Amino acid sequence: SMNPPPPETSNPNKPKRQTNQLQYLLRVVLKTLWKHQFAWPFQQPVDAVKLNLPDYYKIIKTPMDMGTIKKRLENNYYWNAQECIQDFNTMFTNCYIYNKPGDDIVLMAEALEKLFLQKINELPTEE
Numbered sequence: 682s683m684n685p686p687p688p689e690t691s692n693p694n695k696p697k698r699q700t701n702q703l704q705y706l707l708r709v710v711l712k713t714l715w716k717h718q719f720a721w722p723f724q725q726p727v728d729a730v731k732l733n734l735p736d737y738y739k740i741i742k743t744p745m746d747m748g749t750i751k752k753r754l755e756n757n758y759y760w761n762a763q764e765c766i767q768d769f770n771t772m773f774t775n776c777y778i779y780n781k782p783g784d785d786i787v788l789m790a791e792a793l794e795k796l797f798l799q800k801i802n803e804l805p806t807e808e
């Protein structure tokens with residue numbers, strides 16, 4: 682069950698630019714989900730080797746996790762909020778299409794996604 686290289690988390694030739702939305706995504710959205718009791722399965726890429734999941738990276742074409750998202754926000758990898766929101770959505774979608782609906786991991790994803798969507802509802806104006 683081989684692990685792919687983790688997604689890129691630094692862009693060596695992108696200018697450093699804050700926005701109200703990117704500040705919000707790091708300091709409100711990521712920080713709130715990261716400290717949640719159910720965060721830990723999402724804080725790093727799925728280690729298919731350690732968890733013995735030979736089919737995980739066969740089924741999941743676009744791997745994503747909050748560890749990667751946190752590093753991307755800290756490294757100012759995202760040009761805008763929408764790329765970051767897409768990464769959260771991909772992470773949740775991966776969980777829902779791979780794991781059985783009645784799994785603990787899916788209830789954990791649903792709790793984090795509820796919190797995510799509530800915070801995105803109050804996303805600052807594009808400015």
Ligand SMILES: CCOC(=O)CNC(=O)CN(Cc1ccc2nc(-c3cc(C)c(=O)n(C)c3)n(CC3CCOCC3)c2c1)C(=O)c1ccc(N=[N+]=N)cc1
Pocket residue numbers: 721722723727731732733734775776779780785786
């Ligand atoms: C000899 C080989 O033995 C092993 O496999 C050892 N590997 C270990 O350490 C495994 N763990 C910890 C661990 C860390 C991160 C994970 N991330 C996931 C996970 C999977 C899948 C498909 C997925 O889609 N996403 C997004 C994440 N899982 C699976 C679980 C499946 C159940 O629900 C919660 C996620 C993780 C597992 C544990 O065993 C462990 C879990 C909870 C504990 N709490 N207590 N008390 C204590 C330990």
